[PDB]
Amino acid sequence: KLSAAELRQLSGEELRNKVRELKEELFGLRFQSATGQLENTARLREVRKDIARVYTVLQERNLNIVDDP
RNA sequence: CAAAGUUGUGUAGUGCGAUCGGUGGAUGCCUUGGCACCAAGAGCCGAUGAAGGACGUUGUGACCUGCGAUAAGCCCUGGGG
């Protein structure tokens, strides 16, 4: 569970690196789910919620909802 | 013993009554649903793309509800526990 408060302290480039890392983790989780692995099925949804959190932070910086560092 | 005579008939089935069941879903009692109104609102939405949908969306098979690849959900804010 990422926190939007922490992500709001990160800068844009590290936030996008976080987006890409989360996408890669979701890819790996889906492959494990397909192949019979993945005991931890909650992380499969939590990584997508984390992607949503990072997108919310990035877009609120883009739309000036919160000041962009 | 023989004669003459009389009377009787359920081993197939059936009727009526009682009794015991089956089927059926009436009756009674209800209700996550309607009907008729009352009081207060609100009286438009849409190219910043509507009304209405198609497809997808859950850990997993479908459907309803919600949502849209940020997909039964993301953030801020107040409440509450």
Ligand SMILES: [Mg+2]
């Ligand atoms: Mg019945």
